[model samples]
Target: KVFERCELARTLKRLGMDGYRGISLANWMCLAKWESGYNTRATNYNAGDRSTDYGIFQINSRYWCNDGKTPGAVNACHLSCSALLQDNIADAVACAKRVVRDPQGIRAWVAWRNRCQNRDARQYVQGCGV
Candidate 1:
């Protein structure tokens, strides 16, 4: 599913994502923009590591999910990586919450590391009125 920035912000707010698992909405918006651009079906395969990142949050097959084709997947979220590409993001959100709760927190997302971490992400939702 594709969503406008504000639309995604509203939906995420409704899901209590503003501060979910110690992640602020601004950071979430930043991560979403950089990682998947609010497209739920987004997927990226990294040949170097033979891992695939899935969905809006770009959960990785290396540890978070099983892509079936990736050998020795940890599948910590206990779901297929493809499940995250669905229009309904409930499962994805749940999995993201789990990812954030880990010791790495939101840094689990590399996009967050390069694009959002230590940055002033408030502009991501500055006027969304969420």
Candidate 2:
């Protein structure tokens, strides 16, 4: 499923993403927009590391989700990569929050740095009463 931006915003808000660990909802929106275009099943394979980024926020298999294919993956989120691809998004949300708990926080996503960081992200949630 590809979420409309505002619907994604409201959903994330309901999932407690607003101001989560100093990362605002708009930033989260911007990250999702750039990472996967809000597509629930999006996956990006990295041949160099043999890891895959899965789902809306692109939680990685190497460190976050276990796919049994990423070599030496720690599976910090303790969930299957398949869970992140599900349309429900609750597991994805939980993994995202768990990802942020690390020292890097939202900076864990390079897209957040190059695209979402210090940019005008208000357009992500400008309407639909997020």
Q: After superposition, how far is residue 47 of candidate 2 from its true place, in Å?
A: 0.6
Per-candidate TM vs. native? 0.93, 0.98
Runs off by more than 4 Å, candidate 1: none
lDDT of 2 by residue, 1-130 (tens): 9999889999999999999999999999999999999999999999999999999999989899999988999899999899999999999999999999999999999999999887898989998597
Q: Which ten residues in a row have the lowest lDDT in candidate 2?
A: 119-128
Top-scoring candidate (lDDT): 2
Error of 2 at 53 (Å): 0.4
TM-score of candidate 1 versus the correct structure, residues matched by position: 0.93
Number of the predicted model whose TM-score against the real structure is largest? 2
Candidate 2, pairs of clashing residues = none
Residue 78 error, candidate 2, Å: 0.6
- The global C-alpha lDDT for each of the candidates, from Candidate 1 onward, is 0.88, 0.94
